[PDB]
Amino acid sequence: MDVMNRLILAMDLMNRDDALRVTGEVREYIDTVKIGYPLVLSEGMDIIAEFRKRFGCRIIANFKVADIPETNEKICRATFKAGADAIIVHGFPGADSVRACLNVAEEMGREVFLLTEMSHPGAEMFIQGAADEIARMGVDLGVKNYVGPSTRPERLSRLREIIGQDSFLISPGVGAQGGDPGETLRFADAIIVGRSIYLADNPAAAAAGIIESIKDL
Amino acid sequence: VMDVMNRLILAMDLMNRDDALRVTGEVREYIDTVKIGYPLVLSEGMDIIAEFRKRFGCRIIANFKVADIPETNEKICRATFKAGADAIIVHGFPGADSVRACLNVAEEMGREVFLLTEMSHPGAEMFIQGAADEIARMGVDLGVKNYVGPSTRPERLSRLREIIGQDSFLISPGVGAQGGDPGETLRFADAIIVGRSIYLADNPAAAAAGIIESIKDL
Ligand SMILES: O=c1cnn([C@@H]2O[C@H](COP(=O)(O)O)[C@@H](O)[C@H]2O)c(=O)[nH]1
Ligand SMILES: O=c1cnn([C@@H]2O[C@H](COP(=O)(O)O)[C@@H](O)[C@H]2O)c(=O)[nH]1
Predict the structure, then answer these.
(1) Could you give the C-alpha distances from B76 to B34, B73, B79, B134, B149, in angstroms and in order?
(2) Which residue of A69, A148, A186, B88 is most buried, as measured by CB atoms within 10 A?
């Protein structure tokens, strides 16, 4: 996946007008947009097609899929039907649940991103201790795309070590949550940025600023 | 706690609006609490919650297994309650702050949070099971009153009931298609969740009626 400027916009605004306007203001800097439930549950799944129609961007559905196999399959189908290019899935629910997603992705020509360790404080309670094993599980299942925490570069580095250089790794927690753009890119292929851009007084300047800080990368 | 008719909750996971509406309408005389998840919502929109309320006089539990950071969890809960859901199911594995975010929104909006502890599928044994007792303990400490536990593992469901106490409300999926027994599950859970055994039946109403007949004494 060739992410322009190694920057993925997490569009979590909950108003169609604002979401489209802000994305439009930073369109020259990105070609990959991550849409999650905040926007989808507020405006509907048709918003994905609208983004592709207006921006011709790659779409990652950050749905944190975390159900049983049968339900995970249905969620992935509905998501790809809406035009998503990839979907983010939790690894904590186990191998069968991840495999369910991989099957649908393969059938519809899409990608599955395995979330191994989250970036918020609460991730330390249960997820962190299982993160390395979840990553190894991904490797065993043939997963090639992963999600790791910008807020813990040592953990992000460990994830990169487990999955190898060939695997693709994206990382949220940059900016608002405290992660540093440049440091995160030492290990991740692309950084995910939400609020630091979409809540900025001038989103375009915010995006341009982040890119300037990682220009040599 | 919510008064679930016949201690039976329908997991409406059909992805077609017409079929979902038909089946739910056919079993409404037996069930007054319906659980709507992403298979239907991502296929027909959040307005489907409103339509179910309009068409049927049923309570709605949004089975969204909320599992994001606090900031995003709050947004998901807000949008879901705004749509008319009476309650929402949240994962406990992402930690206390993520669960607290959901509880805060539920409190401010006058709705309820159900904490999913251990799941009923085989994969749950890999990571969730080992953290389930603590996840439940965490819920109790946070003031969570509603929980979800696995019907497929009677011993685990029993332990979870002990941890949360008799005053807490517990619902349990995995009944029927996944192997759980209605009666056995009701020894510990206040209500059972049933999806496919009802919605894939040739006569959903008869299927629901049959399940209720098997637990009549309960
Ligand atoms: O471990 C994490 C942390 N955050 N996110 C998501 O990445 C974005 C981070 O946004 P932010 O830049 O505004 O913090 C949000 O969409 C959030 O749900 C994840 O997928 N996993
Ligand atoms: O641990 C579990 C297992 N299943 N479910 C949900 O309960 C329903 C079970 O449906 P079934 O009766 O068709 O197996 C589905 O909506 C499934 O996502 C949960 O919330 N948690």
Answers:
(1) 19, 5, 5, 25, 22
(2) A148
